Design an enzyme around this catalytic site. Structure first.
Site, PDB file in Angstrom:
ATOM      1  N   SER A 139       0.864  -1.189   0.000  1.00 36.81           N
ATOM      2  CA  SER A 139       0.000   0.000   0.000  1.00 36.81           C
ATOM      3  C   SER A 139       0.898   1.234   0.000  1.00 36.81           C
ATOM      4  CB  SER A 139      -0.979  -0.098   1.166  1.00 36.81           C
ATOM      5  OG  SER A 139      -2.002   0.880   1.056  1.00 36.81           O
ATOM      6  N   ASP A 147      -8.153  -4.537  -6.819  1.00 34.19           N
ATOM      7  CA  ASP A 147      -7.688  -3.693  -5.726  1.00 34.19           C
ATOM      8  C   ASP A 147      -7.831  -2.221  -6.098  1.00 34.19           C
ATOM      9  OD1 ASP A 147      -6.395  -2.406  -3.653  1.00 34.19           O
ATOM     10  OD2 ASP A 147      -4.611  -3.677  -3.694  1.00 34.19           O
ATOM     11  N   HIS A 159      -7.523  -5.412  -1.453  1.00 33.60           N
ATOM     12  CA  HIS A 159      -6.262  -4.775  -1.103  1.00 33.60           C
ATOM     13  C   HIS A 159      -5.557  -5.478   0.047  1.00 33.60           C
ATOM     14  CE1 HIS A 159      -3.295  -1.674  -1.063  1.00 33.60           C
ATOM     15  NE2 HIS A 159      -3.643  -1.196   0.118  1.00 33.60           N
TER      16      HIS A 159
END
Ligand SMILES: *[C@@H]1O[C@H](CO)[C@@H](O)[C@H](O)[C@H]1NC(C)=O
Ligand SMILES: *[C@@H]1O[C@H](CO)[C@@H](O)[C@H](O)[C@H]1NC(C)=O
Ligand SMILES: [Mg+2]
Ligand SMILES: [Mg+2]
EC number: 3.1.1.3
Lengths: 269, 269
Positions: B146, B201, B258
């Site tokens: 991320s 995602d 994610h």
């Protein structure tokens, strides 16, 4: 060490219990299809599973869950949700026992669990009894994870013996009563209790045996680790009240193991 | 699909990225063994991996992560952690660009990512070069999930060329720069960037392309579902800058996707 058909049921109702956490609806209108966020109940979604009744913060004790109709696997599932904050629920968990002579003689149950079901029993009893009417050929299953598994165990033992079998699938459920209540849950006819535990999950070890609590027999113990997928050969049936060699071992317990029962449970992505 | 060896590397550095979240000791002493809660990094624990330097809430943009020494795999791993709350970080995300001509001329990077890396670049470059000095035969790998994937990408492109190769493994990383920066990251010398994405995602789709953001090439797209284990046959290599077919598809994105890169990542049980 389990039949493949039993393994499928264990997996299916683990997702029904997880749906009590990750359902897209807590105040659902009756008839909507059941779905989960983050792929929490993929097999529940694959079936023609719709709501029949939903409840959030009902009775006293914050009883949350739903009652579903499965037209594919031919079921009426009553699913109780566990605590919204399991880390909080474990610390502030009371140990007092309350005499439950209304279920069995000499039996004592966890005061919090028993009184929570009674405050909602009169309402839930008609909802299951109206569902069993319009679908008498369907199998009635009670299921739940953590506190939900304890509620489903008390609810199953209280509504059994009124014309229809009630099977109970509990996941990571705490001890709910004394030795007498454990013997009752072990041999009670009119349905089978499937008590599922995972490795060194801490919740099936509470309340302690040092406080008069006892587990029913048998125990279906999942040896596979946390975040590891479960196979048929990773489940061991352990017979004997308060038996050792499964979740009841004198090692250090673990909280993350409480959230992995065939998949992510007790929380949502 | 990808080779067996590259698949093993994808899995190992996903856990190094997940360890940045679920490391037991965040303010860990230098030399302590790297462990995780909830079985979040079992491959790291099996290795002789120790902390060289741990940084938490460092710099300007709350830069958190660790530098690790892996004597089993001969690695010097710099792992960056993403946001503490991914949901709030996705919303409060600016799309402002800032010139970074000192990395490559004509290049513009996300002002948030580039400024955060600069706030600690001097300190981290010295810790890395110190480890390379005492272990010159070791591979230097920057990794992160991320926001951590974005920091690992800009830190690699910055520190590359100074005598040691720097491979970067990013998991669910957003776009970090304009097309000029994307082509630079695509063909830069002195290390290889592995940009890994999962189904739909949402984060690798931010910031939108309409604000002057591009994705480097190629893309390693995990097409297997959320909470589903990954096999090597589930990874697709997709070449081309801002290419479609992998994560860049015209459908509705998803946040749970994610948090599943070879396993649970971005959160801890
Ligand atoms: C509800 O489930 C049934 C059975 O799978 C399906 O045919 C129907 O389209 C679903 N409803 C919605 C709104 O998806
Ligand atoms: C730490 O890890 C090393 C190598 O894996 C091992 O030799 C040592 O016994 C470990 N010690 C502790 C306390 O974990
Ligand atoms: Mg019991
Ligand atoms: Mg990029």
């Amino acid at each position: 060490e389990v039949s493949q058909d039993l393994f499928n049921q264990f997996n299916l109702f683990a997702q029904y219990s997880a749906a009590a956490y990750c359902g897209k609806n807590n105040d659902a209108p009756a008839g909507t299809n059941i779905t989960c966020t983050g792929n929490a109940c993929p097999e529940v979604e694959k079936a023609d599973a719709t709501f029949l009744y939903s409840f959030e913060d009902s009775g006293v004790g914050d009883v949350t869950g739903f009652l579903a109709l499965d037209n594919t696997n031919k079921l009426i599932v009553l699913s109780f949700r566990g605590s919204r904050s399991i880390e909080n629920w474990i610390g502030n968990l009371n140990f007092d026992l309350k005499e439950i002579n209304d279920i069995c003689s000499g039996c004592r149950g966890h005061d919090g669990f028993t009184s929570s079901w009674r405050s909602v029993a009169d309402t839930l009893r008609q909802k299951v009894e109206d569902a069993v009417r319009e679908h008498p050929d369907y199998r009635v299953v009670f299921t739940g994870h953590s506190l939900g598994g304890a509620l489903a165990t008390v609810a199953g033992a209280d509504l059994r013996g009124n014309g229809y079998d009630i099977d109970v699938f509990s996941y990571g459920a705490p001890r709910v009563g004394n030795r007498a209540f454990a013997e009752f849950l072990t041999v009670q006819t009119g349905g089978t209790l499937y008590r599922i535990t995972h490795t060194n999950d801490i919740v099936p070890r509470l309340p302690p045996r040092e406080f008069g609590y006892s587990h029913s027999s048998p125990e279906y113990w999942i040896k596979s680790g946390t975040l590891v997928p479960v196979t048929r050969n990773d489940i061991v049936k352990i017979e004997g009240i308060d038996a050792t060699g499964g979740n009841n071992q004198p090692n250090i317990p673990d909280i993350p193991a409480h959230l992995w029962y065939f998949g992510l449970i007790g929380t949502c992505l």
